[model samples]
Target chain A: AADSADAGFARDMSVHHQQAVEMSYIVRDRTDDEEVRRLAYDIAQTQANQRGMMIGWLDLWALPKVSSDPPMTWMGMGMPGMATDAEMKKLGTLDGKQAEVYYLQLMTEHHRGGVHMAKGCVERCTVGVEKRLARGMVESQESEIRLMADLLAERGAKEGHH
Target chain B: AADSADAGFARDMSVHHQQAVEMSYIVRDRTDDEEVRRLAYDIAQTQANQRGMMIGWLDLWALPKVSDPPMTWMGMPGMATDAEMKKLGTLDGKQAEVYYLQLMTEHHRGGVHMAKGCVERCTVGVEKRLARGMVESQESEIRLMADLLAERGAKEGHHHH
Candidate 1:
């Protein structure tokens, strides 16, 4: 299992989901705008629940989390769409629109990366159920990515800039 | 897995956890009181996270959620029903805080009993361990909520015993 693709994907994405969940909550704290806040709230809960499933996969198999061998994503790459440590820290300091826009941008990138990772799992994970979840993530996050684009448009902000 | 206690507890308790979690998010918005807000966040996050784990187990086991009526798996009473749940949403400020403390206190009373069911009946190694932690932490939070109740001069609601 340690050398398997499923194990690798679970551990890697599990780490990936944790930050996105926090980013949403952080944004929620910064804004009272119902549109953005509700979206963030939804994102946090969805990602948090998915992360729990990933961790559940590990626990059911009794696999250790901090694999020295690492997931394929970590073999020579940071998982796609990951928020860098600096960026996440920057988020904590911002408020109002700045926080909402940055969060939108970060999570859009985050979702894109999540989609990529999920695709790899869908193609490679040996388990049927796990593959199905990866497929579900791809579909849901892709839809949310569109929803986020609309949110960004309403805020007069695009993905890349202020 | 459904007939097994492991499956039953995971199914029944996720529903239980989800209600408390829903309560936490609602409470967070109703008051700006930091202590209560912070407490709500803690309770919501922990319960939600736990709800995730139970869901994970079900998904991993290839077990679907729910078959019998709610809490039928555990053979016990659970959550306070939709009336007070809606009631909590209509309130805000200290009224919200006071009502939340009372509501959650009774909610925890029901939760504590349910968790103890898993401790006694669940068969999986990790599930039993998880159940044990719920009993411990939830009971602690129950005490903590009591003090918050006193400080806010709130009274407890009728727990669904």
Candidate 2:
């Protein structure tokens, strides 16, 4: 019953940010590479904070955090670039530069997916704050995706094929 | 100009939450102990998210993030001094865990104090509700950290002035 672009974006993006924070933590533990670690920390902190805002808004609207509808349905399609369960498990098994490269690759894709969702909300969301947040997400995540690309290239890696 | 408890609490609590997040990240790096690492992750995630919310509200309200003297709001107590924070950063293993537990216990107490002030003073219904929630959650964490400290043959440290 609680169906809207705003609600769906909030719910799905919160789940998305959860994985990003988890990936950041894992990479931080695996590598001493300052640039990668710093990027991981910033990503974890920023996404966690954004995740909180969306969840808080859901609470404010008296909406359930969990929904019965399939995820990303409000956007009329699947989320782009989301990591599969197997990919996530494989990320956990990696270490050092391998972990750093995989994390950057996965996160680059994750940010792209986030940007896609945010662009959807920008076109559809009605609330001013939520719209602004979606716009901000698009801007910030796109920029980070570029930065991740640079970091990947520095490590002789590139964004994943996903 | 920016005298409301709501504005002041939002500004000051964001600063308070920043330290907790930093401490959480530091502890996470210093220890492999699952219990400590789990607590660090939760605290870091929770506070960072809450910090973002408070800042978001400030933006929504069209208020500047900066205000007059920090900590004037709620007469915030137990803030870790620069020396204490440096010491916390340098510690490792159980020492880091104990210090983090002590610091965070004190930090949560200060956070609860601020939240209580906002609950009493902020007229905005939503902000007041958020403040009330902070009081409950921080108090719960304070108790948890105390137990965590005790499990390591330690106890809560004295409140910082």
Candidate 3:
């Protein structure tokens, strides 16, 4: 049961979502830009809530939240789309427009990975509500990814391009 | 089905936790003090996470998030009036920090009561344990806030309706 896709997705996704939340908090402080600050706030709030829901499900099921299995092992792949520790710290050093563009770039990558995992859950999770939540994540994160690209363009930058 | 204390605590506390989150966000914008700002961030993060858990429980249980009147779960809980909430938004710097701390202190007092109500009355084991945890944590924070307020030469009693 612990090794099942349902449990694995929640376990791994919770860790993934937390990095997004932490990065959002860092970006919020690094920028005075309203657009980027607003996006960061929304990202932090949404991901934290979703993270809690996953943890709550684990609690309700009495499953261990930690696993020795490699991340995404249940999904038949390794983890993807996470920002490196160096990239995360780099986001903190930036300010203003530069910070906004970097955050957009990092978050676009973050959401891409999230959408892939959510799609995995939609196909594999046993719980109906959890599957529905995953489907919603896929929709929202994909839309946000598009939105981030536009924000990047607005700042004369492109996602993932220097 | 909605009559259960388990559902009621989940419903009522979610509302209470949301107010704490909102107040914390407001204060974070209003203050330059790292101490208060960090505390506000901590409050917002903790309350929002806990709020989601309650909401998630409701979804899992197929219960409603809304109610006809607030606090039907235990028939009562403390909440800030609309004017008080609006007034906090108008203040800045130390005024905001003091008011937020006072209001948050008031909110936690109410929270401890409701969580205790759940601890005594809820039928669901997990919900009961969560309430007990809230009781422990909220009280610890209340004392911590009192220390914070004292450091600023402010205390909770000065703020009123």
Error of 2 at B115 (Å): 1.4
Q: Of 1 and 3, which scores higher on DockQ? A: 1
User: Candidate 2 chain B TM?
Assistant: 0.94
Per-residue CA lDDT of candidate 3, range B72-145, in tens?
Answer: 66754558878888999999998899888888988999999999989989988877888999999999999999
Model 1 residue B99 distance off true place after TM-score fit, in angstroms? 1.5
Alpha-carbon TM-score of each model against the true structure: 0.91, 0.91, 0.96
Better of 1 and 2 by lDDT: 2
- Candidate with maximal DockQ: 1
**lDDT of candidate 2 over A39-151, digit per residue (tens):** 88888888888887788677667799989889888988745768899988998899889999999999988998899889999998887888999999999999899898899
Any runs in candidate 2 off by more than 4 Å, and if so which? B71-75, B158-160
Judge the docking of candidate 1 as incorrect, acceptable, medium or high: medium
Q: What fraction of the correct interface contacts does each predicted structure contain?
A: 0.75, 0.50, 0.55
Positional deviation of B118 in candidate 3, in angstroms? 0.7
Q: Give the TM-score of candidate 2.
A: 0.91
Clash pairs for candidate 1? none
Best by TM-score: 3
DockQ, all candidates in order: 0.73, 0.55, 0.72
State in Å the error of residue A109, model 3.
Answer: 0.2
